[PDB]
Design an enzyme around this catalytic site. Structure first.
Site, PDB file in Angstrom:
ATOM      1  CD  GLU A 234       3.652 -26.342  -6.657  1.00  8.99           C
ATOM      2  OE1 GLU A 234       2.861 -27.288  -7.065  1.00  8.99           O
ATOM      3  OE2 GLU A 234       4.796 -26.541  -6.305  1.00  8.99           O
TER       4      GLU A 234
ATOM      5  CG  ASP B 250       2.755 -34.870  -6.758  1.00  9.07           C
ATOM      6  OD1 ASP B 250       3.071 -35.919  -7.454  1.00  9.07           O
ATOM      7  OD2 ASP B 250       3.318 -34.588  -5.716  1.00  9.07           O
TER       8      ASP B 250
ATOM      9  CG  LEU C  90       2.513 -34.702  -0.409  1.00  9.46           C
ATOM     10  CD1 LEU C  90       2.220 -35.369  -1.744  1.00  9.46           C
ATOM     11  CD2 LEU C  90       3.926 -35.100   0.020  1.00  9.46           C
TER      12      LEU C  90
ATOM     13  CG  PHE D  32       5.918 -24.565  -1.673  1.00  9.84           C
ATOM     14  CD1 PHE D  32       5.310 -25.169  -2.774  1.00  9.84           C
ATOM     15  CD2 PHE D  32       5.108 -24.023  -0.692  1.00  9.84           C
ATOM     16  CE1 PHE D  32       3.940 -25.277  -2.871  1.00  9.84           C
ATOM     17  CE2 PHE D  32       3.723 -24.121  -0.769  1.00  9.84           C
ATOM     18  CZ  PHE D  32       3.143 -24.781  -1.836  1.00  9.84           C
TER      19      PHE D  32
ATOM     20  CB  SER E 299      23.278 -25.670  -6.478  1.00 10.73           C
ATOM     21  OG  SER E 299      23.174 -26.136  -7.778  1.00 10.73           O
TER      22      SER E 299
ATOM     23  CG  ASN F 149      25.869 -27.860  -9.632  1.00 14.08           C
ATOM     24  OD1 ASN F 149      25.045 -28.004  -8.675  1.00 14.08           O
ATOM     25  ND2 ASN F 149      26.860 -28.711  -9.867  1.00 14.08           N
TER      26      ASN F 149
END
Ligand SMILES: [Cl-]
Ligand SMILES: [Cl-]
Length: 162
Positions: free
Chosen positions: A11, A20, A32, A104, A117, A132
């Protein structure tokens, strides 16, 4: 290597409001602020979040404070979620970090959308789940970070981050 260091690599750290990869207003370590187009909606959320008049800028301390909150919230969210919790419980320590990373970034609702998945992780079919999981917008949008998380799931090591 730990969850904090892993997410900090993925990040980055920014002390000024920024956009972002999706065009959203963010600050610090992937926090965010708003999906609204208004920089003012963003500056407002920011002060609400820090407890001060920030005028779109924060300190390292404040960014780390926000980061501790978000990791904790991600972990408590997985543990409260009926779809995610069994998956987390079934996993070893490294892979658990991988699911926290997805959560996150994409929220609980979004990961909970990876039904297939998740089922394969749960059955410990690493290779299949990796294949997948790559069939997603997520992978198409942030391919390098996705590949890193996906390898973490495939292998169970921190290789992709070292
Ligand atoms: Cl696809
Ligand atoms: Cl990326």
């Amino acid at each position: 290597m730990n969850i904090f260091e892993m997410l900090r690599i993925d990040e980055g750290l920014r002390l000024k409001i920024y956009k972002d990869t999706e065009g959203y207003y963010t600050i610090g370590i992937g926090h965010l602020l708003t999906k609204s187009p208004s920089l003012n909606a963003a500056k407002s959320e920011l002060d609400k979040a820090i407890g001060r008049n920030c005028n779109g800028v924060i300190t390292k301390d404040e960014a780390e404070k926000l980061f501790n909150q978000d990791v904790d919230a991600a972990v408590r969210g997985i543990l409260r979620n009926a779809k995610l919790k069994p998956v987390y419980d079934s996993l070893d320590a490294v892979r658990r970090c991988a699911l926290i990373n997805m959560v996150f970034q994409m929220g609980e609702t979004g990961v909970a959308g990876f039904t297939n998945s998740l089922r394969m992780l749960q059955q410990k079919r690493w290779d299949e789940a990796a294949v997948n999981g790559a069939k997603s917008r997520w992978y198409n949008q942030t391919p390098n970070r996705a590949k890193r998380v996906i390898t973490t799931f495939r292998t169970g090591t921190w290789d992709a981050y070292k």
